[PDB]
C-alpha cells in the first residue's frame, strides 16, 4: 500500500541507492516491485561560448533529471524503523507518498 517517488541526478549513484531501496526493502519489508523506471526527464537548454557577439559559436546543455519509482505491499515495523533512520544521497533527492 506504499508509493515512493525518486528524483535523482547522477545515474550510478542514484541507481545503487534505488537498488539499495528495493534490495533492503525486500528484507525489512516483503515483496518490493522493482524500480519500474520513469523516463529521464530533461530540462533542455542552449547557449554560446564567445562574448564578442556573433551568430555562431554555440553549445547545447541538458539538465538530465533521473526519475525512479517504487511500490510496496503491506508494510512492517522494521521497514519504517531502519528505512527511516538511514540514507546517504550526498546529492540525489527522494520524495514519497502513501496513497
Amino acid at each position: 500500500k506504499i508509493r515512493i517517488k525518486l528524483r535523482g541526478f547522477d545515474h550510478k549513484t542514484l541507481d545503487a541507492s534505488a537498488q539499495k531501496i528495493v534490495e533492503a526493502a525486500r528484507r525489512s519489508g516483503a515483496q518490493v516491485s522493482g524500480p519500474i523506471p520513469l523516463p529521464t526527464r530533461v530540462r533542455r537548454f542552449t547557449v554560446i561560448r564567445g562574448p564578442f557577439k556573433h551568430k555562431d559559436s554555440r553549445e547545447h546543455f541538458e539538465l538530465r533529471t533521473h526519475n525512479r519509482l517504487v511500490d510496496i505491499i503491506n508494510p512492517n515495523r522494521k521497514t519504517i524503523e531502519q528505512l527511516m533512520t538511514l540514507d546517504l544521497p550526498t546529492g540525489v533527492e527522494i520524495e514519497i507518498k502513501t496513497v
Binding site: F9, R43, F45, V47, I48, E59, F61, E62, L63, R64
Partner: peptide, 27 residues
C-alpha cells in the same frame, strides 16, 4: 529566467564545474 543567469555567465559557472547534474551534452 529559470536561474536568472545570462548566456556567458551561465556558461562560466557551468564550465567551471560548480553545478550538479549539468552535462556537456553528447547526444
Amino acid at each position: 529566467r529559470f536561474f536568472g543567469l545570462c548566456r556567458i555567465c551561465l556558461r562560466e559557472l557551468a564550465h567551471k564545474g560548480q553545478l550538479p547534474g549539468v552535462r556537456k551534452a553528447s547526444w
